[PDB]
């Protein structure tokens, strides 16, 4: 799909992995 | 060069936060730093209390800003009254 | 302009910088034209006008401070007043400035 919704998928990839990794 | 960026505000250490420490750094550089004098010509140092500057090597004092000599809000008034003085 | 002609006095010509050396020259009737700065004080500026009109000498007011009058003469220091005794290839005595 267009590269702002695909691109908004990196919000819930990065910031969710921040809770994961810093642990 | 010792510090990567912190500059003058490294005295506070790790306290108060990043956003406030940079906010202080912009103003605390100006008040401690030197001027270029209008009457004399010489340029060191000088500052003593908020508003009052300063004398280099001559002994004259000037009403300036809190953390700077030339306040830009007063500099435009210096030109505004210049225009109205003509008539 | 005045900045062009002052360069032509320095090379091939004579001049004395500073307040005391100006008064030494004005007393003896040597100076032909003195160049007073802007930021110089009024008490000093009024004195040189009175010294000049006795011996009858031109007093051109240089529009600009002492820091840029020093750069005009080709030096690395502030100057308040510049006399002109004998200009060689220059042409500032003939003109008004």
């Amino acid at each position: 799909m267009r590269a702002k919704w695909r691109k908004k998928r990196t919000r819930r990839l990065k910031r969710k992995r921040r809770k994961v990794r810093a642990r | 060069k010792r510090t990567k960026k912190v500059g003058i505000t490294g005295k506070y250490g790790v306290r108060y936060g990043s956003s406030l420490r940079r906010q202080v750094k912009k103003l605390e550089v100006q008040q401690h730093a030197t001027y270029n004098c209008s009457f004399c010509g010489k340029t060191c140092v000088k500052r003593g209390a908020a508003g009052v500057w300063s004398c280099s090597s001559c002994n004259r004092t000037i009403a300036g800003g809190a953390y700077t000599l030339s306040t830009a809000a007063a500099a435009t008034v210096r030109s505004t009254i210049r225009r109205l003085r003509d008539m | 302009n005045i900045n062009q002609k002052l360069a032509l006095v320095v090379k091939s010509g004579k001049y004395s910088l500073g307040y005391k050396s100006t008064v030494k020259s004005l007393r003896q009737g040597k100076a032909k034209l003195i160049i007073i700065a802007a930021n110089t004080p009024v008490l000093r500026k009024s004195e040189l006008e009175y010294y000049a009109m006795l011996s009858k000498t031109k007093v051109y007011y240089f529009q600009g401070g002492n820091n840029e009058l020093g750069t005009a003469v080709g030096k690395l220091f502030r100057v308040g007043v510049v006399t002109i005794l004998d200009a060689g290839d220059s042409d500032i005595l003939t003109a008004l400035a």
Binding site: - | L20, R60, A66, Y67, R85 | -
Partner: protein
């Protein structure tokens, strides 16, 4: 001490005696020591000079303005503040004036005002950081600092106080027609909550 404004002390002569009287002026940004100042109706329009509002054109800037004539100063004496002249009237000696909050006011034409913006501007910009900096500000003014929150207090000491959880309980918006003791909160509020842009 304890004032956002550098003062200035000017020496005038006595017209009727061989003497000198010093007057304490608030220095506008532009003044310096060893400078002349011209105060009166016939005085000219420069930074520092004191003129009456009638002999001044529209769109000028002033400070230390008198409400009456003979008030000796009232309006716009704080740091980085200035009054702007808008209008004029021939019938009724009364100029139109805008105060630094926003609310305009009609002042008499013979009232005074010192020209220029008040010195020591940009004082509020720097943050205080450490609490000791805030202590030293109020140390040379009043005893108005370490303020405890009223909800944290007991129900005897303050209306909001009391309860198992720290809550107010009833509306903090209190009327104008109240009495002393009750008035703790927002007094005679038109709006509440977060305001957007325009004041």
């Amino acid at each position: 001490a304890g004032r956002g404004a550098p003062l200035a002390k000017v020496v005038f002569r006595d017209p009727y005696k061989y003497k000198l009287r010093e007057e304490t002026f608030i220095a506008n940004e532009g003044l310096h020591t060893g400078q002349f100042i011209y105060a009166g109706k016939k005085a000219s329009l420069n930074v520092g000079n004191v003129l009456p509002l009638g002999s001044v054109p529209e769109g000028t800037i002033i400070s230390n303005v008198e409400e009456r004539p003979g008030d000796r100063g009232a309006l716009a004496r704080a740091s980085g503040n200035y009054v702007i002249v808008i209008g004029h009237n021939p019938e009724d000696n009364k100029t139109r004036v805008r105060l630094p909050s926003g609310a305009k006011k009609i002042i008499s034409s013979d009232a005074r005002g010192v020209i220029g913006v008040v010195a020591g501007g940009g004082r509020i910009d720097k943050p205080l950081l450490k609490a000791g900096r805030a202590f030293h500000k109020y140390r040379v003014k009043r005893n108005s600092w370490p303020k405890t929150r009223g909800v944290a207090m007991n129900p005897v000491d303050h209306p909001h106080g009391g309860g198992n959880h720290q809550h107010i309980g009833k509306a903090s918006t209190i009327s104008r027609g109240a009495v002393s003791g009750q008035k703790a909160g927002l007094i005679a509020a038109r709006r509440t909550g977060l305001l957007r842009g325009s004041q």
